[PDB]
Design an enzyme around this catalytic site. Structure first.
Site, PDB file in Angstrom:
ATOM      1  N   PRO A  76      -8.126   8.573   7.177  1.00 38.03           N
ATOM      2  CA  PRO A  76      -8.319   8.935   5.801  1.00 38.03           C
ATOM      3  C   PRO A  76      -7.229   9.909   5.333  1.00 38.03           C
ATOM      4  CG  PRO A  76     -10.298   9.334   7.071  1.00 38.03           C
ATOM      5  CD  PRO A  76      -9.092   9.316   7.970  1.00 38.03           C
TER       6      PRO A  76
ATOM      7  N   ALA B  84       0.844  -1.205   0.000  1.00 37.40           N
ATOM      8  CA  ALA B  84       0.000   0.000   0.000  1.00 37.40           C
ATOM      9  C   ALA B  84       0.880   1.257   0.000  1.00 37.40           C
ATOM     10  CB  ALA B  84      -0.907  -0.016   1.203  1.00 37.40           C
TER      11      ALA B  84
ATOM     12  N   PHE C 189       5.413  15.680   6.696  1.00 35.86           N
ATOM     13  CA  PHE C 189       4.476  14.989   5.845  1.00 35.86           C
ATOM     14  C   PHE C 189       3.173  14.720   6.594  1.00 35.86           C
ATOM     15  CE2 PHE C 189       3.081  10.764   4.065  1.00 35.86           C
ATOM     16  CZ  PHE C 189       2.665  11.236   2.839  1.00 35.86           C
TER      17      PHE C 189
ATOM     18  N   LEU D 275      15.546  -0.305   1.529  1.00 37.13           N
ATOM     19  CA  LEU D 275      15.735  -0.971   2.828  1.00 37.13           C
ATOM     20  C   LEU D 275      17.216  -0.971   3.250  1.00 37.13           C
ATOM     21  CD1 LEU D 275      13.238  -3.876   2.203  1.00 37.13           C
ATOM     22  CD2 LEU D 275      12.918  -1.818   3.539  1.00 37.13           C
TER      23      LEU D 275
ATOM     24  N   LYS E  71      -7.060   2.976  -2.335  1.00 34.36           N
ATOM     25  CA  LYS E  71      -6.892   3.099  -0.882  1.00 34.36           C
ATOM     26  C   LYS E  71      -7.280   4.516  -0.414  1.00 34.36           C
ATOM     27  CE  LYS E  71      -3.557   3.594   2.716  1.00 34.36           C
ATOM     28  NZ  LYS E  71      -2.476   3.005   3.533  1.00 34.36           N
TER      29      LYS E  71
HETATM   30  C1  LIG Z   1       6.869  -6.950   5.972  1.00 36.33           C
HETATM   31  C2  LIG Z   1       7.085  -5.743   5.109  1.00 36.33           C
HETATM   32  C3  LIG Z   1       5.985  -5.116   4.550  1.00 36.33           C
HETATM   33  C4  LIG Z   1       6.119  -3.998   3.739  1.00 36.33           C
HETATM   34  C5  LIG Z   1       7.466  -3.436   3.452  1.00 36.33           C
HETATM   35  C6  LIG Z   1       8.578  -4.067   4.009  1.00 36.33           C
HETATM   36  C7  LIG Z   1       8.439  -5.202   4.819  1.00 36.33           C
HETATM   37  C8  LIG Z   1       9.668  -5.871   5.401  1.00 36.33           C
HETATM   38  N1  LIG Z   1       7.560  -2.266   2.652  1.00 36.33           N
HETATM   39  C9  LIG Z   1       8.856  -1.819   2.119  1.00 36.33           C
HETATM   40  C10 LIG Z   1       8.915  -2.146   0.630  1.00 36.33           C
HETATM   41  O1  LIG Z   1       8.492  -3.494   0.438  1.00 36.33           O
HETATM   42  C11 LIG Z   1      10.328  -1.945   0.076  1.00 36.33           C
HETATM   43  O2  LIG Z   1      10.561  -0.526   0.136  1.00 36.33           O
HETATM   44  C12 LIG Z   1      10.519  -2.445  -1.356  1.00 36.33           C
HETATM   45  O3  LIG Z   1       9.294  -2.979  -1.886  1.00 36.33           O
HETATM   46  C13 LIG Z   1      11.663  -3.470  -1.473  1.00 36.33           C
HETATM   47  O4  LIG Z   1      12.886  -2.914  -0.956  1.00 36.33           O
HETATM   48  P1  LIG Z   1      14.310  -3.034  -1.643  1.00 36.33           P
HETATM   49  O5  LIG Z   1      14.149  -2.878  -3.115  1.00 36.33           O
HETATM   50  O6  LIG Z   1      15.162  -1.935  -1.061  1.00 36.33           O
HETATM   51  O7  LIG Z   1      15.080  -4.370  -1.222  1.00 36.33           O
HETATM   52  P2  LIG Z   1      14.760  -5.830  -1.792  1.00 36.33           P
HETATM   53  O8  LIG Z   1      15.228  -6.818  -0.743  1.00 36.33           O
HETATM   54  O9  LIG Z   1      13.289  -5.870  -2.011  1.00 36.33           O
HETATM   55  O10 LIG Z   1      15.593  -6.029  -3.107  1.00 36.33           O
HETATM   56  C14 LIG Z   1      16.996  -6.203  -2.937  1.00 36.33           C
HETATM   57  C15 LIG Z   1      17.655  -6.276  -4.281  1.00 36.33           C
HETATM   58  O11 LIG Z   1      19.072  -6.351  -4.092  1.00 36.33           O
HETATM   59  C16 LIG Z   1      19.542  -7.524  -4.745  1.00 36.33           C
HETATM   60  N2  LIG Z   1      20.796  -8.059  -4.147  1.00 36.33           N
HETATM   61  C17 LIG Z   1      21.048  -8.335  -2.861  1.00 36.33           C
HETATM   62  N3  LIG Z   1      22.302  -8.833  -2.744  1.00 36.33           N
HETATM   63  C18 LIG Z   1      22.854  -8.895  -3.942  1.00 36.33           C
HETATM   64  C19 LIG Z   1      24.154  -9.314  -4.505  1.00 36.33           C
HETATM   65  N4  LIG Z   1      25.138  -9.787  -3.723  1.00 36.33           N
HETATM   66  N5  LIG Z   1      24.308  -9.184  -5.846  1.00 36.33           N
HETATM   67  C20 LIG Z   1      23.342  -8.703  -6.653  1.00 36.33           C
HETATM   68  N6  LIG Z   1      22.134  -8.303  -6.186  1.00 36.33           N
HETATM   69  C21 LIG Z   1      21.855  -8.379  -4.864  1.00 36.33           C
HETATM   70  C22 LIG Z   1      18.373  -8.471  -4.600  1.00 36.33           C
HETATM   71  O12 LIG Z   1      18.548  -9.606  -5.413  1.00 36.33           O
HETATM   72  C23 LIG Z   1      17.233  -7.546  -4.990  1.00 36.33           C
HETATM   73  O13 LIG Z   1      17.142  -7.220  -6.378  1.00 36.33           O
HETATM   74  C24 LIG Z   1       6.330  -1.591   2.336  1.00 36.33           C
HETATM   75  N7  LIG Z   1       6.281  -0.375   1.746  1.00 36.33           N
HETATM   76  C25 LIG Z   1       5.122   0.226   1.410  1.00 36.33           C
HETATM   77  O14 LIG Z   1       5.131   1.368   0.914  1.00 36.33           O
HETATM   78  N8  LIG Z   1       3.863  -0.273   1.789  1.00 36.33           N
HETATM   79  C26 LIG Z   1       3.768  -1.563   2.288  1.00 36.33           C
HETATM   80  O15 LIG Z   1       2.647  -2.031   2.546  1.00 36.33           O
HETATM   81  C27 LIG Z   1       5.039  -2.251   2.666  1.00 36.33           C
HETATM   82  N9  LIG Z   1       5.028  -3.436   3.247  1.00 36.33           N
END
Ligand SMILES: Cc1cc2c(cc1C)N(C[C@H](O)[C@H](O)[C@H](O)COP(=O)(O)OP(=O)(O)OC[C@H]1O[C@@H](n3cnc4c(N)ncnc43)[C@H](O)[C@@H]1O)c1[nH]c(=O)[nH]c(=O)c1N2
Ligand SMILES: Cc1cc2c(cc1C)N(C[C@H](O)[C@H](O)[C@H](O)COP(=O)(O)OP(=O)(O)OC[C@H]1O[C@@H](n3cnc4c(N)ncnc43)[C@H](O)[C@@H]1O)c1[nH]c(=O)[nH]c(=O)c1N2
EC number: 1.14.19.59
Lengths: 520, 522
Positions: free
Chosen positions: A111, A50, A456, A349, A79
């Protein structure tokens, strides 16, 4: 003399990485080479997600991508708020609200509807004054936002001619957004896509990165590196040795368990909002989408084992504990000391994070990228450019962390050791100051209609969470005692909220019907 | 037990006093008794005051007073900018600009026109890049505002049909604005006017004011007191004993000698702007109205004696010192440690002050008024209301103190001790932070078009002053090197300035002719 950045290497192909490639692709106008290094081997988070309303304006609009275009691609749903369920009352998890003493269900809304004002005072304050004077028992969300009546009837935020009825953010499957921006970046912004794993980070003597080595043997040189490698933070934390600042003394949740539950949209329609369902040791999200809804139980792993949480999570929806497609992730809560160090910029992250209670994660990404476009360096890496970026991240993250901390520290529940421990926690000085402002009956963070990111969370949003949880002002806004004309005016605004809330449910299409014309 | 304030006593009936009474009279909706105690004193020469564009929105509109109605009552005129004359070149003061080493006249503008943007970047930044790269020889004010061409032609900021062409503020005799407000409060909000001299401030055991004794033997009871007594701060500094923090180590000027000069408007026209004419020990304002201009030499009395300043002022205008009616003031510079203490709120000269280089005085009044109304209390005087009001005052005052520091610290004149001593002042941390940001090529306090008072001086204004004085960023905004298309988009913006400058200079009435129609003088 050309001293520009010539090559940008982004490590990571999740949402952070492709957002970064898409946005810098648009921002640098084909003057820079952009490489995304991403290992298919190393999964990306992707859990059903979301957002907040500025997504379309501060990101997709920048890319030239209309809403209905991206929306159609990632099974996007509407939403209008976060709805909080069973946050005030004790007990085990349930989707259904328990009953309060006044016989109202234990639910309150957050909201994105903007509060109307009378005499330069927002409706919340008029509502708080009648409450504290015993002239109304009605709840804040019901009285001040038409949206609430629209959400309870599950109606859409747009008519069938696609005329806007209300403010709204988005639900979507992260994976599909990632995949959509990957195609966008590669086939419209000419980003090089390298599918491989990084094995080594080459730095020089001054501690600046020069390339990343891959297992295949390719060496990807670059002048600027963006770390979207996820929680592991392979450039900012590992290679650059920037410490992470742990903030598990401000918010306790550090874990989640999620899955995608299928759903009967003809029978129960679709809720046009994210529900946040309280639990014994945390809460559980619900993100409706056409045919399915994402969900996941955020919890502290100090107050519950992966078993208990998975079990309570499973009970919630009536799922099989032993043969379900679960998603278990442990998470960082905090921010890096410095988000951007030398020629490494953390985004996503790899940078900062709080639990997903108010949908901060994608917002943080496009705000960080925007901040980077604004402070985009050349090869001299001006100290002031780097430090202003870092101060901006710092502020954006503490703004949100304190707003989240407000959700837990004021909660009345005391039934479980999690909820009790959320009162032992120390509040950052800035949130305590705002609570003080609030308690004096003054506005907190009045809206101003870039610098959104600094402040914000507006007055409207602090009132949803304080008054929702039952934290009231000590007394009414004192100025209102002298303003009988403005009080009358606000009675007209209160009528205006009911008459609009009545008119729109009768005329508006259901959320499901609107998602039918939009999608397949 | 009703806890509300029933009586508000305002001490002072200058501008601060009568703005306070009128605004409170509207804000408190006749649920509160408002009393203005003030001494008649005497009537003096109107040396004129200048303002900023929010005066009408933030004050007169709240009272439902149309612009033309109040202007018609105080011989008002239009102000599109402050124009700095000879701030970059040495020597005695002259109204006429000296010629810089590059052949230009030594004049630069600070307009009120907001800048346009290409690609979320202000036009200023496109100008600075071209300038540091050698691609334009043009001045910032000429490059970025059509107001500059309109002002150079003495054209009005509105057409004869009263349609707006540019952003502007006002010039007027503030004694008349005060008299117009006095009349409005007294006839339309039944303010209690007591014409008397306060002789004693009564206080209770907890330090709260309970009443003001007058000479004639009134004991004026009140629950809240507003100190509008001027520089004397009879309530906040004397009665309540709140220290003033002197800030003459941030800004040197502390004195003024001023007069009103008859002006031949049919000959010279009327400048739609305030002029700041650099002197050896200070600067002199020129504030045109129909028929005369107010003028006054602001100076440091460490660097000049009164007689010296007064003689230099006279020589500037070809005035006869002995046959000219002067007002003379020594003013403090700073703010009270707390603007509001217990049940005493300070507004106007009783509160904070800085020299009038950028028209902060009347602004400080209606801003503090507005802040009082937002934090208006009951008799419990919650310490959070009082503390938040004080927070806002000091943030408002520091924004402006910073801005005014920028004007002096980056002047390249070294010709007299005054000008040199400006460069040995300690900049506050926040203005130093802005300079660094600017010097790195970044925006300073980007505009966002209530809270305006936090961050009133925006990027355009900091560029007018920095670039006007000669302080450039060390290098262009780096992002601009990567944005060939945005650069080209800004070129069109530059062209729209030139064209709109051409059109409005041809199509607008003279400031003189507009005034004639507004004041009904023709
Ligand atoms: C449980 C939960 C729930 C949510 C959320 C987080 C968590 C933990 N978030 C955050 C959101 O999901 C996040 O911001 C992104 O979708 C994914 O983050 P990243 O791209 O930074 O890391 P992510 O882990 O997703 O990707 C990492 C990348 O780095 C690569 N990588 C790692 N090591 C490597 C290596 N040695 N060599 C090459 N590549 C490598 C991986 O393969 C991958 O492509 C969120 N946000 C939101 O706005 N609303 C929501 O509802 C949620 N919900
Ligand atoms: C040199 C200079 C130049 C400028 C300015 C100031 C100065 C000093 N100003 C500021 C502006 O002129 C000023 O703030 C207001 O016009 C007047 O402010 P006060 O009402 O606070 O003081 P002010 O001194 O005018 O009034 C004090 C009142 O208190 C009364 N009083 C005192 N003692 C008393 C007692 N014991 N009993 C009863 N009554 C008593 C007085 O009699 C009077 O009525 C300005 N602003 C601006 O916006 N732009 C401009 O260009 C300028 N220019």
């Amino acid at each position: 003399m050309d001293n520009r950045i010539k090559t940008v290497v982004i490590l990571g192909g999740g949402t952070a990485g492709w957002m970064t490639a898409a946005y810098l692709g648009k921002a640098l106008q084909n003057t820079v080479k952009i490489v995304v290094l991403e290992a298919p081997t190393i999964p990306r988070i992707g859990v059903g997600e979301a957002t907040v309303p500025n997504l379309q304006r501060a990101f997709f609009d920048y890319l030239g991508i209309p809403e209905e275009e991206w929306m159609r691609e990632c099974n996007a749903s509407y939403k209008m708020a976060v709805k909080f369920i069973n946050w005030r009352t004790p007990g085990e998890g349930s989707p259904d609200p328990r009953t309060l003493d006044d016989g109202h269900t234990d639910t309150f809304h957050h909201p994105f509807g903007l509060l109307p004002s009378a005499d330069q005072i927002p409706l919340s304050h008029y509502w708080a004054a009648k409450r504290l004077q015993g002239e109304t028992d009605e709840n804040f969300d019901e009285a001040c936002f038409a949206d609430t009546a629209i959400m309870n009837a599950k109606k859409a935020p747009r008519f069938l001619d696609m005329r806007r009825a209300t403010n709204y953010a988005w639900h979507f499957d992260a994976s599909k957004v990632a995949a959509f921006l990957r195609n966008f970046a590669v086939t419209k912004q000419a980003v090089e896509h390298v599918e491989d794993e990084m094995t080594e980070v080459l730095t020089d003597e001054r501690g600046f990165i020069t390339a990343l080595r891959t297992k295949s043997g390719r060496i990807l040189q670059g002048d600027l590196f963006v770390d979207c490698s996820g929680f592991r933070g392979l450039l900012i934390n590992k290679a650059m040795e920037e410490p992470f600042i742990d903030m598990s003394d401000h918010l306790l949740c550090n874990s989640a368990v999620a899955t995608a539950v299928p759903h009967d949209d003809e029978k129960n329609g679709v809720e046009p909002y994210t529900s946040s369902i309280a639990m014994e040791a945390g809460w559980t999200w619900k993100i409706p989408m056409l045919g399915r809804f994402g969900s996941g139980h955020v919890y502290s792993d100090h107050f519950a084992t992966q078993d208990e949480a998975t079990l309570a999570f499973s009970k919630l929806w009536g799922l099989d504990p032993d043969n379900t497609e679960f998603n278990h992730v442990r998470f960082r809560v905090g921010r890096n000391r410095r988000a951007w160090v030398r020629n490494c910029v953390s985004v996503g992250l790899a940078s900062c994070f709080v639990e997903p209670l108010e949908s901060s994660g994608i917002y943080f990404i496009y705000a960080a990228i925007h901040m980077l476009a604004k402070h985009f360096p050349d090869k001299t890496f001006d100290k002031v450019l780097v430090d202003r970026f870092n101060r901006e991240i710092e502020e954006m993250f503490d703004d949100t962390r304190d707003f989240l901390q407000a959700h837990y520290y004021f909660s009345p529940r005391v039934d479980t050791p999690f909820w009790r421990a959320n009162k032992e926690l120390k509040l950052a000085d800035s949130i305590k100051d705002k609570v003080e402002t609030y308690r004096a009956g003054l506005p907190v963070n009045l809206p101003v209609t870039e610098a959104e990111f600094r402040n914000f969370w507006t007055n409207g949003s602090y009132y949803c969470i304080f008054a929702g949880l039952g934290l009231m002002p000590r007394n009414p806004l004192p100025a209102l005692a002298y303003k009988p004309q403005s009080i009358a005016e606000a009675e007209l605004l209160f009528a205006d909220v009911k008459r609009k809330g009545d008119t729109l449910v009768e005329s508006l299409p259901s959320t499901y019907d609107l998602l039918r014309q939009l999608h397949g």
